[PDB]
């Protein structure tokens, strides 16, 4: 399965593809939001692990976008904890919303758990 990383900060980015490649998923990376898009529109990832805070377009533009054209699965992953950050996220269209700083293992979890009913 192919995962999509989407942060603009590369000491993350770098965890969490660490942490798929353990899992055996084949990893590709965007820095910002105009990126984001174009791997999304060149790779067609199983999953996407979404930022919010992002340079050029924003996380919450993305993932709309990326909704008027696909269901692939969208686990937003942000330090924008507030009950407004997770509700308009989801309501936007994200399948899961998960808080920065994260546990390995629960991202791990949760990306098995959005393969599963996708
Ligand atoms: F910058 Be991400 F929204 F934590
Ligand atoms: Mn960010």
């Known amino acids: 399965?192919?995962?999509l990383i989407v942060d603009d900060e590369?000491?993350?980015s770098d965890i969490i593809k660490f942490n798929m490649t353990k899992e055996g998923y084949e990893v590709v990376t965007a820095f910002n939001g105009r990126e984001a898009l174009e791997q999304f529109?060149?790779?067609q990832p199983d999953i996407?692990?979404?930022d919010l805070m992002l340079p050029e377009i924003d996380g919450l533009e993305v993932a709309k976008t990326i909704r008027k054209?696909?269901?692939v699965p969208?686990?937003?992953l942000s330090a924008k904890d507030s009950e407004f950050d997770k509700v308009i996220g989801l309501?936007?269209?994200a399948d899961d919303y998960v808080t920065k700083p994260f546990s390995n293992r629960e991202l791990?979890?949760?990306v098995k758990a959005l393969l599963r009913r996708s």
Do not use: V
């Open 1 to 3: 399965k192919k995962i």
């Open 10 to 12: 590369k000491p993350i």
């Open 41 to 43: 529109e060149a790779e």
């Open 48 to 50: 996407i692990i979404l």
């Open 69 to 71: 054209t696909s269901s």
């Open 74 to 76: 969208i686990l937003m």
């Open 91 to 93: 309501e936007l269209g």
């Open 108 to 110: 791990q979890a949760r």
